[PDB]
Amino acid sequence: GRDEAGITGTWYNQLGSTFIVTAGADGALTGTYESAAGKAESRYVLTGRYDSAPATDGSGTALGWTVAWKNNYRNAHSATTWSGQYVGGAEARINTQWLLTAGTTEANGWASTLVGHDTFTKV
Amino acid sequence: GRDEAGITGTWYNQLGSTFIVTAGADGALTGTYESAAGKAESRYVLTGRYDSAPATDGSGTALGWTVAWKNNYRNAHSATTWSGQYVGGAEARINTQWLLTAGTTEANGWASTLVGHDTFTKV
Amino acid sequence: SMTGGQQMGRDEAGITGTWYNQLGSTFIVTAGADGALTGTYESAAGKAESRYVLTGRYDSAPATDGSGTALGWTVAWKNNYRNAHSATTWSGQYVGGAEARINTQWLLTAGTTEANGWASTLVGHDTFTKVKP
Amino acid sequence: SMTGGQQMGRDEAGITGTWYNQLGSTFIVTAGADGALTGTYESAAGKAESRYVLTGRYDSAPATDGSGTALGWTVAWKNNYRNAHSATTWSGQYVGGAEARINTQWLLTAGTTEANGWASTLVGHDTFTKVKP
Ligand SMILES: O=C(CCCC[C@@H]1SC[C@@H]2NC(=O)N[C@@H]21)NC1CCN(c2ccncc2)CC1
Ligand SMILES: O=C(CCCC[C@@H]1SC[C@@H]2NC(=O)N[C@@H]21)NC1CCN(c2ccncc2)CC1
Ligand SMILES: O=C(CCCC[C@@H]1SC[C@@H]2NC(=O)N[C@@H]21)NC1CCN(c2ccncc2)CC1
Ligand SMILES: O=C(CCCC[C@@H]1SC[C@@H]2NC(=O)N[C@@H]21)NC1CCN(c2ccncc2)CC1
């Protein structure tokens, strides 16, 4: 797998959150996320998908994953999905944008979703 | 599981795309997506997460999932993540916003990501 | 014009007027001949009271292939009654015709400390029509 | 003022000037005393040529707790050289100080047919500084 080895490993973003991921041979992503920010403590299950056969033209590798913010310590009734691309090489990075949706009443639904961007670097 | 039965099943969105999902007992989401739009043909693997213990106060249930747009028929070098909440009842619906990231060169990276909103209804 | 009034572009008359979204917020806009959008916004939701000044831009010469007309506008949520230290931009398109519509997505950013910066921005979607709830 | 010039608010002087994002696009803005944002935009990327009019709004009385100052602005991508039938809104905050910054997210919506409506909108993030590349 071209990027299997490149994607799999331990990453950290600009907040200092940590993203431990394994890129499967079938395109699957699995691992754990630990947020340095928000209503989060310890590690949360993640799962996702990546393009296991990216273009050979210098293109990044598209990928995405979801965390639901429930674990054995806390439940923030929320989920974040990161959508981005892996860029291999010198400085491998995963450049993402994300959508954090909280469970709300219908009167509060208009304000359910935060949006942001995380840049990940490896170890 | 409160919403296990509610979330699991076959959903269709406003474009007529179909979202077949199984809500796991551990918070996992799995299934297949078939897009009525874009560079997509037939079904694509999805995986995601949902809050398996949502608030009892009339709140929706937060959830998210990823499709990488590679299957046996086509590869669009792209991934969509849907971020939203399930709202049970009369009219069960899953109200989402999504981020579609394509693999790009670094000169084209500024325009890598589309954003939209899909509303799903069951069968 | 032939009757003596001024000649309106396309979307000038269509966009200009009073609009309502699914929250029941009120969007009073005047589309300028130069591409300017001006007016007021009254939100039915959130930390908002009375009317807020808005300004924006729209494509005053849109494609003639059936496509909508692109536009956008900003409200900063400060007026003489309230300051929510935040601003919303709507980006969308106008779709003319029988039931005219403005279909938008929006980005609401709040002023924050650097430590709360990751959570500065809300995202959503509003559909506007000229029919009142 | 004491020397005879006009008294600038906070962010009035800080925001007003010439800015550059990581693409090397050029953002020339004047922050009005009334909360108005006006100026021009020259994009180094995409279907754009020369300068585009912009308008927006900013919080002219921001919190005094160290938080940034919220703002937003629209460009419709039509000028006398090019029409990309599309409009970008930036939503973000101004962070004053040693290296002042404007940290934004943006929504670029194109006019589309209803069948291409699902793909109307691009999303991204630009950081602006007053230092040129
Ligand atoms: O704080 C968390 C869980 C931790 C999120 C951490 C985020 S993930 C993207 C970013 N990258 C990181 O590395 N860390 C941050 N969850 C909700 C709870 C309730 N919230 C809302 C929001 C809007 N409406 C209603 C309620 C606010 C956030
Ligand atoms: O079309 C697809 C795959 C099918 C996506 C279907 C989408 S999922 C959200 C929405 N809800 C649905 O039910 N269906 C649609 N993928 C890319 C290919 C290259 N694209 C870009 C975009 C920006 N920059 C570069 C390249 C455009 C889209
Ligand atoms: O509520 C308002 C002002 C009114 C917004 C009304 C919104 S405009 C899009 C939608 N369409 C409408 O018609 N009406 C609603 N402003 C902030 C300030 C504090 N907020 C945050 C969020 C994140 N971090 C820090 C602070 C949350 C909300
Ligand atoms: O390229 C431009 C105009 C220039 C935008 C420049 C952008 S502003 C945010 C970013 N920051 C900058 O400094 N520069 C860039 N416009 C459209 C028209 C056609 N497009 C679509 C997309 C989706 N559906 C249909 C058509 C793609 C691009």
Author numbering:
A (entry chain B), B (entry chain B): 11 to 133
C (entry chain A), D (entry chain A): 3 to 135
Q: What wording appears in the published article?
A:
We describe here the use of an artificial cofactor employing the well‐known biotin‐streptavidin system to catalyze a Baylis‐Hillman reaction. As protein host, we chose streptavidin, as it can be easily crystallized and thereby supports the design process. There are several examples using streptavidin as the host for these cofactors, since its natural ligand biotin binds strongly (K d∼10−15 M) and is easy to modify with catalysts at the carboxylic acid group. No enzyme is known to naturally catalyze the Baylis‐Hillman reaction, a very versatile and atom‐economic C−C bond forming reaction for the production of various functionalized compounds and intermediates of active pharmaceutical ingredients (APIs).
